[PDB]
Design a protein around this nucleic acid. Structure first.
Ligand code: FE
Length: 202
DNA sequence: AGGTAAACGT
DNA sequence: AACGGTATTACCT
């Protein structure tokens, strides 16, 4: 049974690419460090984040924004690594979205206990493009729901190298991550990373 | 008029 | 601990 209309899980799709992806995460974060962003309402998110590509997702006093500039460094986000772009391209193609051209990659880091409450991806001006989401490291329980927050959730363990793609009918579905269980992974040691690719600009 | 933010109790 | 209230509002543009 497929994940949803327009949505697919490609299990271990990025397994072979994972070590390089992780090297590139570290490179990105060396320029735009992981930070736990503060919501408009004043709470510090449990997931630490950074971005690469032309646009990066950020919070600010007034809301959320995709910005060409990292508000912490006041410099552009690091360029999207070729490994990221290539893996995204292959995954998108395998998932039935051969024309996807991301201009934004949000990198999430989960420590034990870190979570991401249900939310929608809908801040992009062009909602025709899918989201490609790559899991690395420790396993996490991904919630994938529907258009409304109370729509029943599917709960999927996402393991190292799993890639999830949603778009078309499921593009705006709610999704989240349940508090990360402590554990060990040989590549990430004690955390989980996620890469979310988007087309956030024109 | 619409778009926005949302991350405690049971 | 899975589920759902809260934004059922108060502001912007
Ligand atoms: Fe999301």
């Amino acid at each position: 049974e497929p994940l949803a209309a327009g949505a697919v899980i490609l299990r271990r799709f990025a397994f072979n690419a994972a070590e390089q992806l992780i090297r590139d995460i570290n490179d990105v974060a060396s320029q735009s460090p992981f930070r736990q962003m503060v919501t408009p309402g004043g709470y510090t998110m449990s997931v630490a984040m950074t971005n690469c590509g032309h646009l990066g997702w950020t919070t600010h006093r007034q809301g959320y924004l995709y910005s060409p500039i990292d508000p912490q460094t006041n410099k552009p986000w690091p360029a999207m690594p070729q490994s990221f772009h290539n893996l995204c391209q292959r995954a998108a193609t395998a998932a039935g979205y051969p024309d996807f051209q991301p201009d934004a990659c949000l990198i999430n880091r989960y420590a034990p206990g870190a979570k991401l409450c249900l939310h929608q991806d809908k801040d992009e001006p062009d909602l025709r493009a899918p989201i490609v989401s790559v899991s690395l490291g420790l396993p996490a329980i991904f919630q994938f729901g529907g258009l409304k927050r109370n729509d029943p959730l599917k709960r999927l363990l996402l393991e190292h190298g799993d890639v999830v793609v949603w778009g078309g009918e499921s593009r705006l579905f709610y999704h989240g991550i349940q508090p990360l269980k402590a554990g060990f992974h040989p590549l990430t040691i004690d955390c989980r990373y996620n890469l979310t690719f988007r087309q956030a600009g024109k």
